[PDB]
Subunit: 242 residues, 2 copies
């Protein structure tokens, strides 16, 4: 049905609501949260969105922001959840996200563990908190105890130190331990941005996680996006059948 | 003066009070009130006045959904409050007169400053949690918040209590994530915890425990006193005064 915005704390979160083509009275919905540098219309997100719509699952692609921090993003994602809970057509709510959106939905799904029926982290950037505690962020090295006011960051973006100050506090493993419902992690084994082996490890820690490895592929699935969508389709058909 | 500090879409009401003499350079203490509280409460103002009297400017800030700040009480959470406090610290770091920055807070504000001090441990020179509600996260994990009991795995949409207020269960979803002990471990600079041993609202013994966890914390017990120091508010301000004189003395 199209572009929309969700009000949160005096800012507006841009989103898109897409229904399955038959316009069902009642259907499940998947929240899809792109990453920090990305956008909802990007190929790797749209492909997943179209795939879900095709199997009868509505989608709500959303920005997790309108000084970015994981506290702001998580706050915004709770607003998106709260919006989705009010939609009359919705049966069950699912969550998917890519890269820093993947980390964010890993966190938010635990916070929403009673509501979110299954979780799909796509190449989640889930090591950020630990790396921030070592005093690294991309090519920068600082004393983890003396954080710079400004950090030159992802895709040229300038972040405040508050990003790190907040990130350092997040114990990802606590949120993994608390989400015991089904998870599908997808990750390319030639990912140059986020190490594949991180997803291996997080897959073993979750109680109920399937890891799907995209052989040869990059962070945004430049080579085999279709293997991503096939895995998501198979997993989500399994879940909507329960 | 009173002023608004912008925090993205949310204006935060704040009061800047200077020492009498209007010094060109002085320390600044950020002061954060508690849950349902605000910056003009008796105990808050008493601490503020004491600080100004020894030469410390103060910045009292009303948090999201409190006092004269934007937002609805029901939509506040500790993540919003910690966002708010980072905004107030960022504002303070731009004030030309400021030398060192300190933090103090009561109850939920005391918890909040424990957390924010750790995140700002390079910047915040000492920390004063006043009857800090430091057990909120652990107790939320067990299914209670300030006397209300619920299923911590099927959190209510809304909690209705506190003189006709409403609170979304998102407050609890957020609180449950917070590992207070991590933040205690990270802040190794001087700490003064004050707490009344007849506190009806938040248990005294948790402050005894946290005081022992901290690297450098002194615990001042107010004998017989209540959550907001109904009987011996002067003993609180004297303890703040002596501790702060020790920190600022040059």
């Amino acid at each position: 049905s199209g572009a929309m915005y969700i009000d949160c704390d005096g800012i507006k979160l841009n989103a898109y609501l897409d229904m399955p083509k038959n316009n069902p009275e009642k259907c499940p919905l998947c929240i899809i949260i792109h990453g920090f540098t990305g956008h909802s219309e990007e190929r790797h997100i749209v492909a997943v969105q179209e795939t879900l719509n095709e199997i009868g699952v509505a989608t709500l692609r959303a920005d997790m922001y309108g000084d970015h921090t994981l506290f702001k993003w998580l706050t915004n994602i709770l607003a998106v959840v709260d919006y989705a809970k009010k939609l009359d057509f919705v049966t069950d709510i699912y969550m998917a996200g890519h890269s820093q959106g993947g980390l964010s939905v890993m966190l938010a799904a635990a916070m929403e563990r009673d509501i979110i029926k299954a979780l799909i982290p796509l190449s989640p950037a889930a090591m950020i908190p630990e790396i921030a505690r070592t005093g690294e962020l991309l090519g920068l090295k600082f004393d983890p105890e003396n954080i710079p006011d400004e950090l030159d960051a992802w895709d040229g973006r300038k972040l405040k130190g508050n990003y790190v100050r907040v990130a350092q506090t997040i114990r990802v493993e606590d949120f993994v331990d608390k989400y015991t419902k089904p998870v599908l992690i997808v990750h390319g084994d030639q990912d140059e941005a986020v190490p594949y082996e991180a997803s291996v490890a997080f897959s073993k820690q979750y109680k109920n996680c399937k890891l799907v490895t995209i052989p040869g592929d990059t962070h945004c699935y430049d080579h085999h996006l279709e293997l991503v969508t096939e895995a998501v389709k198979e997993f989500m058909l399994e879940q909507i059948a329960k």
